[PDB]
Amino acid sequence: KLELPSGAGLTADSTPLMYQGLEVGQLTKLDLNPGGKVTGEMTVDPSVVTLLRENTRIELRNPKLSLSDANLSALLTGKTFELVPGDGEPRKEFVVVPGEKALLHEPDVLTLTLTAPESYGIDAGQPLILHGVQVGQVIDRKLTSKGVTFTVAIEPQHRELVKGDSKFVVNSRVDVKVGLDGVEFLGASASEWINGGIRILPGDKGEMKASYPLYANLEKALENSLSDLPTTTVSLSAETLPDVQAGSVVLYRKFEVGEVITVRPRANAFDIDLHIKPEYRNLLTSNSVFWAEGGAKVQLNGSGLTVQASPLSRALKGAISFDNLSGASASQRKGDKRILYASETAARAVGGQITLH
Amino acid sequence: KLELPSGAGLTADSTPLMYQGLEVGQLTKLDLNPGGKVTGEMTVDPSVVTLLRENTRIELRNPKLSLSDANLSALLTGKTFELVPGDGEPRKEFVVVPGEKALLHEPDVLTLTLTAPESYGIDAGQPLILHGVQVGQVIDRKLTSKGVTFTVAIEPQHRELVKGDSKFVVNSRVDVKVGLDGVEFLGASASEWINGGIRILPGDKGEMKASYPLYANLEKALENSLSDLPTTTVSLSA
């Protein structure tokens, strides 16, 4: 006896049970029980009755379009029951599921509910890719009020390899960043783009938690930034600086680590929010002063005219530097927070304050 | 008894009534009543007569082209009546609508007339997208003297999620802005461009007003600028 999903392409005496490509059984009855429950039953070969066991699954195969092998026999038959055996106690009734849901009902499977703020163009049947090779499959996609929650499955052979710590990257969208020295193509290959799906960045050791986030691209998984707006580490004030609206780099001893994420104008002085990396927050303390500069500063000193070997951020939107020093505590004792100075020498002006008349 | 839109691919004794993929009924009569009114009638299985109720809809399915499942049985049958049940008082006559208009006649549906200054290349059957997933469908497009007025529908499952305040963004046009530090692709993805349609930017709380505007791209919905020319705040002389 079978519990069919829907008797769509199934025939009362003409749908076979394939096993190793050979016809084993025959769907001999097809009913519509009340409640919208299509059930049928099947006569199998007595040689194969030993194979019908507890872990044995019967799933229907679609007449899928083969671009490599143009066969008319596959298109003429239609729907087809495929037998895959298992082990255990011999049973005599089965539950058939559709083609996309079939991976969930393997005897071993790894099912993960992974959340996302958007579908990102991921369909229900996209492949799931580790190291270029397909290791699993997305099963279904359900939209909630918070966002999109996917349900993915991992095949039993690859089950050992994810090891509970992993990152999940979308492969459904292309992304091109252009620059003079920075040229990169993120998110896909053209053959991978038409398949699409979710990429695993596998880790070393974990506990396999229930829910995972789905990162939008590759660098947001390495930054561990599921949200679009990063955490504001330090807040500044500045009267008039042409530096940046958002996206210049935080310099340290003229070196590019950090980012300016939020400014707001005010009638007197800006309010500026900075991002620095979590491995990197030890490099600044209470005794730290901030100063900003804007654009290509061509020095005239002697013969040299040195153009700023700059990130192209600074060429468009002027960067911000900082450094630690000795007596920067007294500048922070006054005022609510640090102040972003307009020049390097103005930020160095610390110490005892005299008055000339 | 059925009130058919037009007896185009329908056959006097060969058009079936599918339910759960199984043949239930059979279109047994097909007439052209005067006034240009095609009506027919159907003999259904007595097991399924309990399912024919007030909210029960009967709509015809086109033999749609399946790229994933190349089946010859779907192309050989043609038009096909699909039964979707409902609840209520048992009725014995129905009204069949075409395939695009079928979403309006669900027992619960959210129908919005949204205006636009241009069609923006939106066809009558484009999908309607929230958060990447299709939540509804455009029904029909009517051109007026002021502009284009669309009529969209939202499925009952997603009806709770729009919450009366939303923005409606076209996905039918691509837009590329180039710059040294500003590089962005607006309006579509290449898979979303061939589907096209209207994107929802959902809000928190509202009253679900009758008419909405259709913004041309994403930033004009965030700027809340339906018109091309913004308001002149201050005037100067130089």
Swiss-Prot record, chain B:
Function comment: Forms a tunnel that spans the entire periplasmic space. Is probably involved in the transport of lipids between the inner membrane and the outer membrane through the tunnel. Forms a dynamic tunnel sufficiently long to mediate lipid transport directly between the two membranes without the need for a shuttle protein. Binds phospholipids. Lipids bind inside the tunnel. Required for outer membrane homeostasis. Contributes to membrane integrity.
Outcome of substituting W193N: Loss of activity
Subcellular location: Cell inner membrane
Protein name (database record): Lipophilic envelope-spanning tunnel protein B
MCE/MlaD 4, as annotated region: 108-216
Gene it is expressed from: letB
Subunit text: Homohexamer. May interact with LetA in the inner membrane. May also interact with partners in the outer membrane.
Effect listed in the UniProt record for changing L72N: Well folded and assembled into a hexameric structure, but loses its function
Family named by the database record: Belongs to the PqiB family.
Region annotation MCE/MlaD 3: where it falls in the sequence: 1-99
Organism: Escherichia coli (strain K12)
Coiled coil: none
Disruption-associated phenotype: The letAB mutant is not sensitive to lauryl sulfobetaine (LSB), but the pqiAB-letAB double mutant is more sensitive to LSB than the pqiAB mutant. Double mutation also increases sensitivity of the pqiAB mutant to caprylyl sulfobetaine.
Free-text note on domains in this protein's UniProt record: The seven MCE (Mammalian Cell Entry) domains of a single protomer of LetB resemble seven beads on a string. Six copies of this linearly configured protomer associate laterally to form a homohexameric assembly. The LetB hexamers form an elongated tube consisting of seven stacked MCE rings, each formed from the association of six identical MCE domains, with a central tunnel. Rings 1, 5, 6 and 7 are dynamic and adopt open and closed states.
Whole sequence portion shown: 284 to 521 of 877
Induction: Induced by a defect in lipopolysaccharide molecules.
